[PDB]
Amino acid sequence: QGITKPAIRRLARRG
Amino acid sequence: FEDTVEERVINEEYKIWKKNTPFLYDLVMTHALQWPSLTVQWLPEVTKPEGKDYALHWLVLGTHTSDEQNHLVVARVHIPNDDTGKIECEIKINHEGEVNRARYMPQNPHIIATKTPSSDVLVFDYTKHPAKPDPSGECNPDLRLRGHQKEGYGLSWNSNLSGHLLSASDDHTVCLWDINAGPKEGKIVDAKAIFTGHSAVVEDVAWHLLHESLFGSVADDQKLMIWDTRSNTTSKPSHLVDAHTAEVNCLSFNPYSEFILATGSADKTVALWDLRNLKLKLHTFESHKDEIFQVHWSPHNETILASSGTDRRLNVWDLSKIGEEQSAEDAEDGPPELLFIHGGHTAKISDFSWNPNEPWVICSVSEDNIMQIWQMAENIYND
Ligand SMILES: [As]
């Protein structure tokens, strides 16, 4: 799901 | 003091953070202390013990109790190798009142200065105190530094001039001590200089990391001041900067660039500054939802900055991404230089510290007794 790097990077910015 | 409504919101957001941690962190260790610490700083020492699967690191912590006996604490921690964790008390020393802030001397790491609810700033040499503190609780500092009328938080040792210490106070002043001077016996030393440039509570103070005479101060008068200890004036700084539109709470010099400085404010922004021309604010970092109280540059990456405060968040910034174009979707989360938001705390973050020996490792402490040792996933910064 949110396993791709761009998605993880986006999770990081959302906290 | 608790908001039962806000508490439900915080707890549910935490549960979500917790299950997301394998995505976001290479390491997450959380420890509840009996008392909250208002202060953290990693000691410079590290060792990898023979036949062990962990590295030994050390933290300078404090205690915050209004009722009971306070302590200055050095904690020993296990940091697991990349092939959970443990915290023990290396030493515990009786301390009068809460420890507002505690800082080790760069030249001699076993010398630690502390700020107290009172006006005296204390100095401890932990090699000169019992391995276990006397339950009677009598506080016996090696040095008491006189000069202030009120308490404060700001503390800074000169890393180029051994024994020279700066302190910031609610009394509007910055005090300067040289702890190698004084009399034979010997416990009390008076302020060598007292700087009165500010017209309000001075929140933080910091020596330049390369020039032994330069330091910066930051106050509720919304000003950043740059001082020179050579000059025969203590009432007027070398530079007076209108840094923010609200109280300035913190400042931090870049350890790789002798010219650049960061500043954190109650106006919810971090400001970048260049010492060669202070008329021009280099940059403004926006994203924090409340007062910023602490800012620290990464000791391993020159473009990496971290900030924290009242919004229970710790933000990591990457300067190398400023001005970089984002999609409209990514712009909603914040500016391109926002690398990482740490949502592991459930109350205000009082202080944090970058691990000087393990890149990307941070220790942050909150007002609800939690200390977290964490390192964000390599996938996030390895681009
Ligand atoms: As301990």
Structural description of this entry:
The complex is a heterodimer of chains A (15) and B (383). With 15 residues, chain A is an all-alpha fold. Chain A has one helix at 5-14. Chain A is elongated and about 15 Å long. Chain B has one domain: YVTN repeat-like/Quinoprotein amine dehydrogenase (Methylamine Dehydrogenase, Chain H, 7 Propeller), CATH 2.130.10.10. Chain B is 8% helix and 44% strand. The relative contact order of chain B is 0.12. Chain B is mainly beta and 383 residues long. Bound molecules: arsenic. Residues 73, 75, 89 of chain B line the site of arsenic. It is classed as histone/chaperone.
Provide a brief overview of the structure.
The complex is a heterodimer of chains A (15) and B (383). Chain A is mainly alpha-helical.
Structural class of chain A: mainly alpha
Strand portion of chain A, in percent?
under 5%
Total helical segments of chain A: 1
Helix content bin of chain B = under 10%
Question: What gross morphology of chain A would you assign?
Answer: elongated
CATH superfamily of chain B: YVTN repeat-like/Quinoprotein amine dehydrogenase
Structural class of chain B: mainly beta
By oligomeric state, this entry counts as heterodimer
Number of strands of chain B: 29
The gyration radius over C-alpha positions of chain A equals: 6 Å
Number of domains of chain B: 1
The share of residues in extended strands of chain B comes to 35-45%
**Major sheet of chain B:** 5 strands, mixed
Report the helical percentage of chain A. 55-70%
Number of strands of chain A: 0
CATH architecture name of chain B = 7 Propeller
The N- to C-terminal Cα distance of chain B equals 44 Å
The N- and C-terminal alpha carbons of chain A lie at a distance of 17 Å
| Strand adjacency order, main sheet of chain B | 6-7-8-9-13
CATH class of chain B: Mainly Beta
Largest interface (C-beta under 8 Å): A-B, 11 and 19 residues
Keywords (chain B): Acetylation, Chaperone, Chromatin regulator, DNA replication, Isopeptide bond, Nucleus, Phosphoprotein, Repeat, Repressor, Transcription, Transcription regulation, Ubl conjugation, WD repeat
Pfam families (chain B): CAF1C_H4-bd, WD40
InterPro entries (chain B): G-protein_beta_WD-40_rep, Histone-bd_RBBP4-like_N, WD40/YVTN_repeat-like_dom_sf, WD40_repeat_CS, WD40_repeat_dom_sf, WD40_rpt, WD_repeat_RBAP46/RBAP48/MSI1
GO biological process, one term (chain B): positive regulation of DNA-templated transcription
